[PDB]
């Protein structure tokens, strides 16, 4: 699909260069339709992935029930409304129910959904739901903090603005003590 659609993406980017008043034949722009098309395919590579392949059977037994957190996961996504990046960090916490996920898989799960055309809220929920369904834990908490370039480089132009979204499932929603421990430990 990527190979077949690459010329169509490059034709659209070349057309955009002309429609902006630019010269697609100028040295600095000659390869731009192809490079922009490849970059856009990389930014949306999460559509190529499934949870099962990403997990790669990296689920292990851990009888003792302790909170596990993977925080400060760098996240790079694309706003679906403007096709402009929104970037930041994801902090994930969960309380296992005898099954523990491979540490890196929590970051790989962030990669499946972040590398798509998105809205922060949907992205946050998808990460929490994927972990819930893969591990069946007592609960999951996900916090996403991001700078949307559509609010800084244009529009409202609020230089310091940041969006924070939160999803708390299972014991992370029902038990405030579990949620408080998670929020204290991700600082």
């Amino acid at each position: 699909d990527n190979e077949l659609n690459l010329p169509n993406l490059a034709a659209a980017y070349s057309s955009i260069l002309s429609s902006l008043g630019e010269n697609p034949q100028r040295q600095g722009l000659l390869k731009t339709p192809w490079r922009a098309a490849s970059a856009m395919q990389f930014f949306t590579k999460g559509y190529q992935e499934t949870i099962s392949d990403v997990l790669n059977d990296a689920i292990f037994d851990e009888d003792h029930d302790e909170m596990v957190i993977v925080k400060d996961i760098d996240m790079f996504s694309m706003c679906e409304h403007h096709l402009v990046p929104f970037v930041g960090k994801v902090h994930i916490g969960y309380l296992p129910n005898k099954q523990v996920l491979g540490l890196s898989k929590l970051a790989r799960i962030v990669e499946i959904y972040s590398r798509r055309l998105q809205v922060q809220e949907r992205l946050t929920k998808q990460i929490a739901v994927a972990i819930t369904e893969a591990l069946r834990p007592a609960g999951v908490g996900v916090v996403v903090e991001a700078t949307h370039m559509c609010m800084v480089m244009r529009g409202v132009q609020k230089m310091n603005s940041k969006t924070v979204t939160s999803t708390m499932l299972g014991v992370f929603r029902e038990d405030p003590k579990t949620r408080e421990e998670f929020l204290t430990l991700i600082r």
């Binding site: 929490a128 834990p137 299972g170 929603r173």
Partner: protein, 83 residues
């Protein structure tokens, strides 16, 4: 004979939780309850949109009496008994 009902945050408004997976299906139907499973939870629950005062009056007509009422976290719970 025992029933547990609850509401969160404010007592004047619903939803009111009125049952679990093993609750009497006829009583749940009588109250107009819906069944759901909140995300990440390992259990189903029955709930109504009515505030708890309305549910308590409906349960009295079914032979239930409030034995105890308690607060726990942000949840207000009533324990009823069919005397």
């Amino acid at each position: 004979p025992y029933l547990l009902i609850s509401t969160q945050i404010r007592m004047e408004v619903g939803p009111t939780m009125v049952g679990d997976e093993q609750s009497d299906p006829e009583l749940m139907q009588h109250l107009g309850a819906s069944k759901r499973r909140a995300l990440g939870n390992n259990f189903y629950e029955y709930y109504v949109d009515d505030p708890p005062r309305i549910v308590l009056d409906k349960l009295e007509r079914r032979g239930f009496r409030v034995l105890s009422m308690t607060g726990v976290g942000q949840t207000l719970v009533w324990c009823l008994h069919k005397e």
